[model samples]
Target: GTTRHVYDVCDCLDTLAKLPDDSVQLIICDPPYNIMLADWDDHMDYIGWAKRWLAEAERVLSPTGSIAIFGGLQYQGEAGSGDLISIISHMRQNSKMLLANLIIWNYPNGMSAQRFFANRHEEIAWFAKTKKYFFDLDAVREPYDEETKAAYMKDKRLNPESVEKGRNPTNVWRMSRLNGNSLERVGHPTQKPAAVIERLVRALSHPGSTVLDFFAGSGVTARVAIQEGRNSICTDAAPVFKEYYQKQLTFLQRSYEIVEGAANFGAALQR
Candidate 1:
């Protein structure tokens, strides 16, 4: 069974500082895009605040670790609002991590827009702590249809083993965004779908490894981690996070132990 630890009303940096170096295998980050959607979304200096946690994220990841950050490139040049471009640019100049891929999350449903092109996508910047970062592409690979599989298998140039294993999902993902009346909703203002987090977790981490989500909004990361047989640490500053996490567990089919506090976290890691 996997161990799940949820901490509420904790600052991101304060929680991140408690973990050991090279401890986490993957970090599923869906940070506030500074669009003023909520009280926590507004930051006086977005990148300045991000850099602190960015450095801490890198420090805590294992050599074969990765982090996937979610945001949009649609900032309107506001004084405090930041976007994926700004974060990517900052990492290029200051961080030592390698840019693995820039994933495009394309959703079919969105609000109508008359001004500019209707926004229907978000970007996920996946960064590897080192070149030796772990990736199980087969875990998240999309299986080919029967016709496509048969056609590829008939081709002499393609290996039968490879043909059966399915194709790479590629950098562009086509998952739907959760609607207002969705069952997965946990009352978080900017909750992400479990499908998105599940793909990242299965591909970037292995069973029994640890996953960390410092800005855990709806605690979807914790749910996916538990279902995938991985230990996880989820923390957020809002007290409502605990309530949302409890709701997420109702959908879990697997067994998991809830570990509490920093001392228990250490003990869970030891086990």
Candidate 2:
């Protein structure tokens, strides 16, 4: 299927501002956690600042849409008041969205520690715009090994169709993070893995549905959206975003059209 992709260099709030209400089906947000990790990391009043985008995110989501936010559970003493939990807390009080799940993304390849247990996981908070939120659980289900599949097929207690389809992937995901020399790296400091974003796109949104990624580091969200046949609008504040996106395109071989800006993304939203 042919997909449309729109990317730009702009503030997240500015990107969301151009979207009409209920225009997006999924939002893959990997926001700056205000942890002071880099020059762009410090938003003094994190939630105070995020509240605007949060509101806009909710407003832009379709009736069956969902938003998935990625962040660290603990910030390695980075001295920031915000993280995934902070956003969840804020959403609880302010948004009408449902707290669908808090996924624990556990990775084995993390830094080791002597004084304390080494950090090994982060959080992906998934919120649904309403009870009518779209979810394609079967799309992301994990297939069992042949041995297990054979056993389940014979079990009288289990439904053969359900067993044939696959098992639920659950809330805890085990995937490896990108290494320093990872080919997928497009020169973004905090880029996420393509597999992780792919699952979110497959499970939360449908083909041809529009996905919006405001914190578009490395532009991986748009890459995955395009690969999966969903139209996307992704923007980052850094001008380097364009460079990273082109680097991503260098490795991509999918059918997609490039839209100029977020406002023009509406041209594809009609699909």
Candidate 3:
């Protein structure tokens, strides 16, 4: 049976510290950019504060585990905001994890801007704990159409089995952003679309493996984990996280046991 736990109004580092080392298989981190989107978004020392969680994240991951961090590349020299480039730069000098790929999340909807090009993309830095990181390419592959499959089948040089599986969803992904009226929205300011989170969970982690999300805004990670049969631990500093997660639960189509608090996380993993 798959298990999941959600901590109410919990700190990221505190929650991560409680987990045993090499226990988590994947972490979906969509941390604050310090853009002052809310009170929690402010950080006097962005990288310094981030380093604490970064260290804990590495310690809790298995040898084959991976972490996907979501952020933009444009916020530089801002008072309280930090971007993906800063995190990647810090990782290069201080961390041993391999930089797997910088995924571009290209969305077609956004606000208009005249001063600069309207922002339409965000970067997701995928880092592996080691060279043996687990990734199921077939799990997230994009299926080919009937016509395309037929054309590939005619080519004698290609393996028909491989062609049928699907094509690689390259670094650049084109998906629609959730509108205000979207059914998936749960009132979290920075809530991510389930489609995006689903792809990451499917490709980076396996069934029954544990996935951690300390900055679980809308609890979409937990939602996806439940549907995918992966155990998960989701925590956030905001008490409202529980409300958002409750909303996510209403949309759940599968059964999963929900355990409360970090103390029960270890026991949940065993079951």
Candidate 4:
């Protein structure tokens, strides 16, 4: 599959509404907390603010589509204040989408607290638009070593074909967060690792499908989409999103045509 991308500086809801219904195959969301790097503790204000985009996100996904939401669950009672938990709870009561998996993203690096378990993990809640949501486990599978493969193949309990294919990556993933001076950083404060995004893209969406990342942080989604041979549309509330995305493009060693704005966005859907 080839690649084509569209990006702009725009609000999340406006971007979602502009897209054709059922046009997107995957949505990568990393919603912002009310406070920068930090929030409302008592009310559902943050989750309420999240309500619109979450609804619109569902409206754009194909029946085979999936959306992966990245966030934390550090404070439980304080949780309704806009964490991933809040979104899922809200979805439980309102959305028809199915929760396929809750991925534990374990990172062995971070600030430590003596009073609590050192914070080392965040989560990716994956939701399928319907019962038929796309998933290619082989695409994200991890191959076993010679000994393990041989043993599994010899076991009557296993299918030789399945044994050779590889093992499930499982819901718990141990990948490190990008370091302070990591090369992948393009100056976006809450940027995520492309490796992580790549896993979701490959497993949740097939080649040539469209992936939407409205937050557009660091434009890593564009980078991964191009490499993985998927079309993409990315937008963010800040104009600096373009700058950060362009920086990502500079390092990408793939071929992709990028449509520049909301006005010409129709070209991206032309595929």
Ranking by TM-score: 3, 2, 1, 4
lDDT of 2 by residue, 99-199 (tens): 99999999988888999899899999999999999999999989899999999989999999999899899999999999899989887888899999999
Of candidates 3 and 2, the better by lDDT: 2
lDDT of 3 by residue, 1-271 (tens): 6465544458887898788889999999999866343434445656867888999999999999999999998875866668998899989999999999999999998999999999999989999999999999999989899999999999999999989999999999999889899999899987899999999999999998888999998899988888898888888988898898888888874557887777777744553
Q: Clashing residue pairs, candidate 4?
A: none
Each candidate: what lDDT? 0.85, 0.87, 0.86, 0.87
Predicted candidate 1: what Cα RMSD to the true structure?
2.7
Worst 10 residues of 1 by lDDT: 34-43
User: What's the lDDT for candidate 2?
Assistant: 0.87
Query: Clashes in each model (backbone N, CA, C under 3 Å)?
Result: 0, 0, 0, 0
> For candidate 1, lDDT tens digit of each residue in 38-156?
43454555786688899999999999999999989888787667899989999999999999999999999998989889988999999999999999999988888999999998999
lDDT of 2 at 24: 94
User: How many steric clashes does model 2 contain?
Assistant: 0
Residues 1-271, candidate 4: write the lDDT tens digits.
4578999999888898898889899999998855332224434467767888899999999999999999898645543355888889999999999999999999978997999889889999999999999999999999999999988978999899888889899999999989888999999888899999999999999888899999987899989998998888999989899999999988874567888887766655655
Candidate 4: list runs displaced more than 4 Å: 35-44, 76-80
Instruction: Give each model a TM-score.
Output: 0.93, 0.93, 0.93, 0.92
The positional error of residue 166 in candidate 1, measured at the CA in angstroms, is 0.2
